[PDB]
Design a protein around this nucleic acid. Structure first.
Lengths: 136, 290, 106, 191, 197, 171
RNA sequence: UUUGCUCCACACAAUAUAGAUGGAUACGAAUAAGGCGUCCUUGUGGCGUCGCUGAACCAUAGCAGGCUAGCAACGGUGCACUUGGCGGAAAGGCCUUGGGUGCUUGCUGGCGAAUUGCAAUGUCAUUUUGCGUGGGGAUAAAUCAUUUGUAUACGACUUAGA
RNA sequence: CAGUCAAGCGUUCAUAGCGACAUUGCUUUUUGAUUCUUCGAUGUCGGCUCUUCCUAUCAUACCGAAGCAGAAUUCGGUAAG
RNA sequence: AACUGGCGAUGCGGGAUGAACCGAACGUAGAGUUAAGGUGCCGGAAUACACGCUCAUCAGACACCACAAAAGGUGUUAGUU
């Protein structure tokens, strides 16, 4: 029959790989790996998101599943052009990871009145759901 | 500087401390390893050492100069009237060892075996296992439950037995109570055996067969406080020794500035618990037999 | 609700000390929920109470309170320095203190 | 130096299948099934076309790129034992005392028993592992054939025979007696 | 922060976990450690076995019953490691060790409760891949601990019961989700989503 | 610290016998300006008959990388003192600026030869841009065409001591 | 030897808490791999999706939470009975059938709060013990002294003794 | 007491076993050098007795090497049970 | 013996412990800042951020200082011709 091997693929770091900056001035913005200096550092650029073009550690950035075509060492203008054409920011915001970040920000930015409103709506939804549980 | 001449150390450090045993009756520190295939069997019996005598037997050793020749041998006689089964114990294994979860006793207990639980027996109301006997007298009112607990748990089962001190010619009237591990079958089978043998008397021939190699566990003879010369067999100091000769001369070096545990000192000799192995059963004789 | 607490929980870790000398005048407090000085800055100047119970009643209560204040931040890990009107008894190392939200600046 | 990527392409014969979970490798072929655990190597696998599998190490040191080719050869060994089989031929060497080697079955275990090695009353008993078959090779004097799929088991049984036929207290350069592996080949060579 | 914190000792490096737990106990946290037979030490088994044998060689010469008491169980090994990091001769250290509890496997008081981990002490996160390590149960058996089989048997029993519990929990969760699918996506769910939850 | 490259131009003190000396220049990688001047006088004392008292410094100017956001190959010729003798060596780095190339060279020499700052002379740093001039394998490894690699065994640093799920090292 | 002793409940009184202030909220194994759904050739399978922290989840509105009413609401939840089990590793806890009663913030109401005066932990959780009350339950031994001698310097120890 | 080098010895063959001319060390058990403690006193030689420890292992266990055919030996390893 | 600085005659912080080393010399207190030394836990203070090297069946781990050498090793790293 057919041999099977688990694919075992995990977020290659390469030219055009979209990363999420974890620490520093950016700390939460998207960038593209423009060049790979070393196993531990890459030239990234974030022109649309506001990350300056810079050499960073792979530790400081989190590789995202996204990836768009990009010539190696392309300038900031070319990176921005290809990023806008591929609409990387939109397909990032569509993800459940970006949506989780946004939800976290919103829950943190809630006020005390909005927390009370969350409590009231939570009670209503709990009542209806716990009723549907027994009725279904 | 070193010892001038080498000699082996006096005594065995594995039989330490040379203190009085915790009781007259020496317990089985470990029972034979369990095999489920074998039938349920007692792994021990209790006897009373009566004395020694002599036997003459034809030795059969193919290669000894005394092959097929009469040899005289010292023997020990242990009076072993049948021991009564009263109760059983179940041991559940835990990451801290075997732990007894319950002990179920028999319906009726012998007067000697309750004398065991008493100290001032004559000035006593003999209230012992009376409420347990009341708990008894039905099919499984509170006894089948304990047996089922021992069956569901308690990977190790031991039966409580006692000796017939009244049969044995001593003056004690106080039976010796002990446990014997049942080393065959399943835990359920062992509990079945114990239930069947409740208040039943087991004879020594059922457990021990002739030409067996058994172990004797007993407390050796007491000899009170003893000096080092006899307690450890150290060399006696020369005749012209001031302040005594049945002593150990150097009981330690200057450093470490302490007497070591391995230096021989005077104290109690005898009355130690001992387990001596590989004694051959020469005869299992019946009492009801001239 | 069944939750009435209006304070943050904190632990009295130890006194201000070097290796072999302590200073009972200044205590170190770990506010539970804070792991950095930048987040401990919110609690600068807030009141702290060590609330204990004694078997003897003094002024109508069997509960006694020692009051204090968060003075500054201590270390890199969100621990702060606190000073009390009476030094904490030193049996209360790892005991619970109440960091109130007053005096407030929100 | 931390080589960025080292990869070896293992070839899979058309008659066998390889099932590689996390690090359990199972080779299935006409001769049977052979499994091996490899959770001690920290390597990666990638199937290509059911006939090539790429073994890879990323950012490995020297001692890691060594183990990569080691596991490559080990998987080729499983495949070769599952296609062609492994056959080890041992000869008996004896100056005066004839070595007498037979098979006994104690409780169904197929022990190999050696007697009269240098003419001693001792019996040299060796066990036989799983999947190992012993044939007393006719057409050639004093030959024993150990055959199987697991080359590790076959070669380790042969090594047991060799290490049980040791000579002690003697000049082993003159007392050349023993059972020595003379052939390490495939069962179905030149099929 | 919590009344009692129960740590799954499996996969934890013994020294890192003991440092963490000692700091917590001194800070005033009650801690229970389970699966101490599954704790890890970096370095080969022979290396750590030699280390324990160097430990065993130390005993008060004139009376071994006074000397260092070399405990064998993995839980007692972890406790010794932690007692080294707590100033145990003062009343404060005695109180911290009174707050600590450590077991082999998971006893009944804790197999029914949540168990946590300490990522700064976990072997998978901390040790460089390829480094050899030992398991405290294996080392304890090698140095004379007598209950590896009992612990493993009871651990298998507890794991079977817990896997049945997890299957039941998944069944209940799937049923509540499927039944409240209708009550979901309602107006209240829309408001909660727009307001964050 | 963060090394900067300085051009330091100094000369001998002008004399009435002959004014306006030959006005030598050097490129010096140093933490700041005081250290830059000190290293300039060190190397000038090694080369010509001059010292700080006998000469003066006419210019110090920190030099920037022409394009500090582009990846280039840097061949660095160094000489250094071991515990036994003096050796010339040649290494190379992938970096975006000469200052970072020199800083990572200093870390490299410290890690691989225990060579401290005092016992290292940066003979030359040459920006090589073409392949087949990169001689070291640990650089030609990353000049591979269309290079892509993963980062297996991701370790995520947590802020809280206790975690409530077992971790994953997936990336 | 005037209510000695054990268990349950609560008129009180007392000494203190290594330190309650909503919740210790349970798969296992792996990590160069997994979790959850779905499909089947039920396997080391195909497909989808998730993670990148618990910033979660549950619980959370009412005099420290009052008194009264209504409305698709027969669902949540506390107490107290009963029912069927499960749990021996240190189980002493976890589920479950059914009958009462209280609340319900699921939605809409009516009344009360003050004055502790501008904060003072502002007293609400127990760990034990004592003294009593009302409902049950059973009516011992040990030691000394004498004896013993399988024991013993003395204690201690085998033993016996209405 | 143990190493490094290797001119030679070993019928040839430096290194089976040795090993000169040189050189590097370890030890504090069989000597000095010093004068820090003790001269309001630490009882000194040796033996006897007894315990324990070290290993640089004489014997015993199991091994590797030889100018080890066997026998007996010799050189080493783990080893102080 | 020479110059200086110290201990004696001097506490305090550090070197775990020390008469001399490091820091710094001292009235009784308070706040802040640091020195030498440190920041896993003991223990106040980052299981900080970087780049490497190392795996030791006697690892190594901080000056005075509480030791180690010659000679070797396709262990592994870098480098020269």
């Amino acid at each position: 029959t057919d041999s099977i091997v688990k694919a075992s693929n995990w977020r290659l770091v390469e030219v055009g790989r979209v990363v999420l900056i974890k620490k520093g001035q950016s700390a939460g913005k998207l960038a593209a790996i423009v060049e790979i200096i070393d196993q531990k550092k890459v030239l990234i650029d974030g022109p649309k998101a506001g990350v300056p073009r810079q050499a960073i550690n792979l530790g400081q950035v989190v590789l995202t599943p996204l990836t768009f075509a990009l010539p190696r060492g392309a300038r900031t203008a070319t990176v921005s052009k290809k990023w806008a054409a591929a609409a990387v920011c939109e397909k990032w915001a569509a993800s459940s990871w970006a949506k989780k970040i946004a939800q976290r920000e919103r829950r943190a930015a809630l006020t005390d009145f909005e927390r009370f409103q969350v409590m009231v709506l939570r009670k209503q939804k709990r009542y209806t759901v716990k009723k549907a549980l027994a009725k279904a | 500087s070193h010892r001038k001449y080498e000699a082996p150390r006096h005594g065995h450090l594995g039989f330490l401390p040379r203190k009085r045993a915790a009781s007259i009756r020496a317990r089985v520190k470990a029972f034979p390893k369990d095999d489920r295939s074998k039938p349920v069997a007692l792994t021990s019996f209790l006897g009373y050492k009566a004395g020694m005598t002599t036997i003459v037997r034809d030795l059969d050793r193919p290669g000894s100069k005394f092959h097929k020749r009469e040899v005289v041998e010292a023997v020990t006689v242990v009076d072993t009237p049948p021991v009564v089964v009263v109760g059983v114990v179940g041991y559940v294994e835990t990451p801290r060892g075997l732990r007894s979860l319950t002990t179920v006793w028999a319906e009726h207990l012998s007067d000697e075996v309750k004398r065991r639980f008493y100290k001032n027996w004559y000035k006593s109301k003999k209230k012992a296992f009376t409420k347990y006997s009341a708990k008894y007298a039905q099919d499984g009112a509170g006894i089948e439950r304990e047996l089922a607990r021992i069956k569901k748990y308690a990977s190790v089962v031991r039966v409580l037995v006692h000796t017939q001190i009244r049969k044995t010619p001593l003056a004690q009237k106080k039976a010796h109570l002990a446990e014997i591990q049942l080393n065959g079958g399943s835990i359920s089978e062992k509990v079945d055996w114990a239930r069947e043998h409740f208040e039943k008397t087991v004879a020594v021939d059922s457990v021990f067969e002739q030409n067996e190699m058994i172990d004797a566990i007993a407390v050796t003879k007491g000899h009170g406080f003893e000096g080092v010369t006899h307690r450890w067999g150290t060399k006696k100091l020369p005749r012209k020794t001031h302040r005594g000769l049945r002593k150990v001369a150097c009981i330690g070096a200057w450093h470490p500035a302490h007497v070591m545990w391995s230096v021989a000192r005077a104290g109690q000799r005898g009355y130690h618990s001992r387990t001596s192995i590989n004694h051959k059963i020469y005869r299992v004789g019946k009492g009801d037999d001239e | 609700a069944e939750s009435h607490r209006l304070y943050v929980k904190g632990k009295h870790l130890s006194y201000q000390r070097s290796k072999r000398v302590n200073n009972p005048n200044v205590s170190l407090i770990k506010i539970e929920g804070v792991a950095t000085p930048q987040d401990a800055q919110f609690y600068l100047g807030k009141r702290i109470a060590y609330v204990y119970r004694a078997s003897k009643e003094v002024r109508g209560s069997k509960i006694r309170v020692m009051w204090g204040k968060v003075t500054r931040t201590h270390g890199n890990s969100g621990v702060v320095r606190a000073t009390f009107r009476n030094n904490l008894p030193a049996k209360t190392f790892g005991a619970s203190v109440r960091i109130f939200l007053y005096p407030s600046n929100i | 130096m931390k080589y960025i990527q080292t990869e070896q392409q293992i070839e899979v014969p058309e008659g066998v299948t390889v099932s590689i979970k996390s690090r359990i490798v199972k080779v299935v072929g006409p001769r049977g099934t052979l499994t091996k655990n490899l959770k001690h190597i920290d390597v990666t696998f990638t199937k290509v076309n059911n006939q090539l599998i790429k073994v890879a190490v990323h950012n490995g040191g020297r001692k890691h790129v060594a183990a990569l080719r080691t596991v490559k050869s080990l998987v080729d060994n499983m495949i070769t034992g599952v296609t062609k089989g492994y056959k080890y031929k041992m000869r008996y060497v004896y100056a005066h005392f004839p070595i007498n080697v037979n098979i006994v079955e104690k409780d169904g275990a197929k022990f190999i028993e050696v007697r009269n090695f240098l003419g001693d009353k001792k019996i040299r008993n060796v066990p036989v592992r799983d999947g190992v078959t012993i044939e007393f090779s006719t057409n050639v004097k004093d030959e024993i054939v150990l055959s199987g799929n697991s080359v590790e088991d076959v070669s380790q049984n042969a090594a047991d025979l060799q290490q049980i036929c040791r000579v002690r207290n003697k000049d082993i350069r003159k007392f050349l007696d023993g059972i020595y592996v003379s052939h390490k080949g495939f069962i179905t060579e030149d099929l | 922060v919590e009344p009692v914190v129960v740590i799954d000792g499996k996969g934890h490096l013994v020294g890192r976990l003991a440092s963490v737990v000692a700091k917590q106990l001194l800070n005033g946290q009650k801690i229970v450690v389970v699966r101490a037979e599954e704790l890890n030490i970096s370095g080969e088994f022979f290396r750590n076995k030699l280390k324990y044998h160097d430990f065993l060689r130390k005993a008060t010469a004139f009376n071994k019953t006074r000397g260092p008491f070399h405990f064998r169980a993995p839980s007692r090994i972890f406790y010794k490691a932690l007692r080294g990091m707590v100033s145990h001769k003062t009343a404060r250290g005695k109180a911290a060790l009174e707050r600590l509890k450590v077991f082999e496997g998971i006893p009944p008081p804790y197999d029914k409760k949540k168990r946590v981990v300490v990522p700064q002490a976990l072997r998978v996160l901390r040790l460089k891949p390829g480094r050899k390590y030992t398991t405290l149960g294996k080392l304890s058996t090698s140095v004379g601990w007598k209950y590896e089989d009992v612990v493993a048997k009871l651990e298998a029993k507890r794991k079977v019961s817990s896997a049945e519990y997890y299957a039941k929990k998944r069944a209940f969760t799937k049923k509540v989700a499927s039944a409240n699918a209708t009550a979901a996506e309602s107006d209240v769910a829309k408001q909660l989503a727009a307001l964050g939850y | 610290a963060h090394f900067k490259e300085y051009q330091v131009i100094g000369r001998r003190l002008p004399t009435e016998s002959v004014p306006e000396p030959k006005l030598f220049r050097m490129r010096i990688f140093a933490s700041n300006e005081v250290i830059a001047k000190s290293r300039y006088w060190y190397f000038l004392q090694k080369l010509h008959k001059v010292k700080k008292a006998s000469g003066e410094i006419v210019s110090i100017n920190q030099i920037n990388e022409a394009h500090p956001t582009k990846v280039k190959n840097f061949g660095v010729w160094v000489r250094y003192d071991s515990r036994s003798g003096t050796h010339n060596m040649y290494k190379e780095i992938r970096d975006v600026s000469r200052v970072a190339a020199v800083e990572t060279l200093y870390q490299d020499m410290a890690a691989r030869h225990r060579a401290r700052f005092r016992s290292i002379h940066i003979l030359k740093v040459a920006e090589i841009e073409k392949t087949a001039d990169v001689k070291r394998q640990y650089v030609k490894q990353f000049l591979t065409k269309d290079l892509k690699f993963p980062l297996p065994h991701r370790v995520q640093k947590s802020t809280k001591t206790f975690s409530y799920k077992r971790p994953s090292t997936f990336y």
